[PDB]
Amino acid sequence: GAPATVTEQGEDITSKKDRGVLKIVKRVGNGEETPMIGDKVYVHYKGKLSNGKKFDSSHDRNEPFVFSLGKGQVIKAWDIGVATMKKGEICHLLCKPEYAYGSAGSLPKIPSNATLFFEIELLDFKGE
Template sequence: MACGKSTSTGKAVYEAQKAIDDKIIADYLKANPTLNATKIDTSGVYYIVIQPGSGNALFTRSTRVTIADTGRLLTTGQLFRQTNEFHPSFTLSEIILGWQLGIPKIKKGGIVRLLIPSRYAYGPNPQPLVGVEFGLKNGLPANAILDFNIQLYDITN
């Protein structure tokens, strides 16, 4: 019985945070109607294609992408990540779910903006080292809603 209570409590906490995140993103989009954001299925992740890119792109979980990105907290605008001249490569299965859903919306050379609810980023898990170099004293907080601009430099299958 204790396990059932724990699970229902966990689900209630998840659903409560989901409602909070979705309202914050909806309010942000309502205040910024020119963004023309599109919701990805029922995920709560929104994307704005800034530049579509070109070529054929087939994305799988093993696709390797080389990107440049800038990440901010949606609620404060605080910068927490910026790659500048360094262009990291990742396999799609290694990155946060919000990126896994959003990056395939563009092709090589494309730029996409992603608004990512916490459940598709790091959820209730704070990231104490992320963003410290940009002034986030304690790193990314738990349940952070993220705002990324991502440029896709290369795709390898």
């Protein structure tokens, strides 16, 4: 399924090249450039466990998720992954626990040492 597709075909976008954040672009953005670090980014997403269990979707509440890019307001994989995206892009990310919620997890939805899958749409981004 999509997590296995990313395991098999995804790009390692980590600086450590530790396969901690793997990416596939699913829809190329019309946007030409990535956001800058510090920019406010607006995303839609769906987040699943690596076994395909959906744990959330922002489309369920018509509510984009907004954060300041690169500021540690979100899991590391998102700061890393969304920084590679262009406006309008949809990607898939697969995120090792070191780049997500680690040993502690985030119960009930996220177990200890969970590898997480996201589909992310970069809707827009704005200056800091």
